[PDB]
């Protein structure tokens, strides 16, 4: 098994911001990592390309992955409408942790958040599966478009994405 | 995230005693710390200003926060009548610890207590969410107006309160 | 006590359709019933007057109550952001049953649904608290604007609402 790396090219209102690469911990949570990988390559016919980060709260996290409703109520996994929480081995240890958003136990679809702080209150409720490899500064740049309620001031989109390793 | 700091200007029978500031551990218990923060700013139209410490047991704790009934039977949170115990990450490790009072599991409202001792028998039953940053001497001053049964001899009031950090 | 009756006056875009009255089972679920009653009078400063039915699925139910986001993601109770499932005494026994919508256990706010069929697969998961007294024919008329996906074809609104009994 070798942990895959995927990239996201972020755009703010169409203008390029930069690339963020992610190492996916397939050595710990392989089903959750293959879901995010396949959705970044879009190999199964649908994926993250073109979707937006609908909720950004500075100093907490950036949430995205809802490619069907673009507002937090949609998304779907490559395994179907929802899939179980694989395990909770990994913890939300600091900035750049990539973890699954959900609506209670076993409702993982395609939404994720990138933590810009340590969020230990979420341990045991959200499956951690990746970490920003390069591009943390780009995630901090994204932060500047959020607010305490999550509203973005510009449309932050995943212009392109795919797998590197 | 940055942990907020709030202050309480305490008064005894009107005559001003001093200021206590508290760091609220938003990195561990964000919902509990936000409830305390917002009830100290008054931004929801209700809060701690003008309420009194109704139970002080020297060498144990000063309990306050009942702003609706002023006697231990009331208070409310910014989330409703009561809210869930957020988590029990922190322990009552010594003096200056700030913790939620309750009437059994998941009954948190606005009542809290400032420990003047380590109270480890309360661990796991009361949510710890803050610590005295500066002003311990004002809490030690407050102790002196309480008794083994908790009755105060003088009206210990939160004259003012708000946020700093 | 005596079981209160509330009424909703339904509008389709602008045109008045008719009034539906509901008996609320305060003898079984007093806290859930009082929540709906107070939101129908609007006595706490907010309530159902003017909100719409955002999801109607013909032969199943009409879902409303989201007066803050108007799309299924909001609503709030008179007791706060959410409240406990009171009990599951009553069953979804047939058309005209009024039950609480939720997002899993203990997430009752203000959203509800009026069953137009017997929905017993929901028993034990949604708190039943009322029954259509007069006006079932108006709920029948509302049905006609839905679709398999819940999308309404007209803006179905609660033009007026209040208590009768």
């Amino acid at each position: 098994m070798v942990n895959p790396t995927v990239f996201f090219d972020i755009a703010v209102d169409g203008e390029p911001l930069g690339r963020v690469s992610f190492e996916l911990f397939a050595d710990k949570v392989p089903k959750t990592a293959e879901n995010f990988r396949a959705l970044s390559t879009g190999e199964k016919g649908f994926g993250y390309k073109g979707s937006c980060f609908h909720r950004i709260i500075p100093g907490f996290m950036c949430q995205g992955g809802d490619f069907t409703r673009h507002n937090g109520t949609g998304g779907k996994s490559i395994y179907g409408e929802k899939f179980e929480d694989e395990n909770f081995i990994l913890k939300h240890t600091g900035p750049g942790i990539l973890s699954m958003a959900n609506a209670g136990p076993n409702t993982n679809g395609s939404q994720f958040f990138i933590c810009t702080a340590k969020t230990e209150w979420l341990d045991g409720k959200h499956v951690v599966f990746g970490k920003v490899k390069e591009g943390m500064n780009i995630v901090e740049a994204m932060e500047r478009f959020g607010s305490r309620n999550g509203k973005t001031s510009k449309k932050i989109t995943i212009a392109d994405c795919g797998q590197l390793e | 995230m940055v942990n907020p700091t709030v202050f309480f200007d305490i008064a005894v029978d009107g005559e001003p005693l001093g200021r206590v500031s508290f760091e609220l551990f938003a990195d561990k218990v964000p919902k509990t710390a936000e409830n305390f923060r917002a009830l100290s700013t008054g931004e929801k139209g209700f809060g701690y200003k003008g309420s009194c410490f109704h139970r002080i047991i020297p060498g144990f704790m000063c309990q306050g926060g009942d702003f609706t009934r002023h006697n231990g039977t009331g208070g409310k949170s910014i989330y409703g009548e009561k809210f869930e115990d957020e988590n029990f990450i922190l322990k009552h490790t010594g003096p200056g610890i700030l913790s939620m009072a309750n009437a059994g599991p998941n009954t948190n409202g606005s009542q809290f207590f400032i420990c003047t001792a380590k109270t480890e028998w309360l661990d796991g039953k009361h949510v710890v969410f803050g610590k005295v940053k500066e002003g311990m001497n004002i809490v030690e001053a407050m102790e002196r107006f309480g008794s083994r049964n908790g009755k105060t001899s003088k009206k210990i009031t939160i004259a003012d309160c708000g946020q700093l950090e | 006590m005596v079981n209160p009756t509330v009424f909703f006056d339904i509008a389709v875009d602008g045109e008045p359709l008719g009034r539906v009255s509901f008996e609320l089972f305060a003898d079984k679920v007093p806290k859930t019933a009082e929540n709906f009653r107070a939101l129908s009078t609007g006595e706490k400063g907010f309530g159902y007057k003017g909100s719409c039915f955002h999801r109607i699925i013909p032969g199943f139910m009409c879902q409303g109550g989201d007066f803050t986001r108007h799309n299924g993601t909001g609503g709030k109770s008179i007791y706060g952001e959410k409240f406990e499932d009171e009990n599951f005494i009553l069953k979804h026994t047939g058309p005209g049953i009024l039950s609480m919508a939720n997002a899993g256990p203990n997430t009752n706010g203000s959203q509800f649904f009026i069953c137009t069929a017997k929905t017993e697969w929901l028993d034990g998961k949604h708190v039943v608290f009322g029954k259509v007294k007069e006006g079932m024919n108006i709920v029948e008329a509302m049905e006609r604007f839905g679709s398999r996906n819940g999308k309404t074809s007209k803006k179905i609104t609660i033009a007026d609402c209040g208590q009768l009994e």
Binding site: M61, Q63, A101, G109 | - | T73, E81, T107, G109
Partner: peptide, 11 residues
């Protein structure tokens, strides 16, 4: 409060 949910976002 500070949660990351999909649909009923709470405080």
């Amino acid at each position: 409060x500070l949660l990351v949910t999909a649909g009923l976002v709470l405080a």
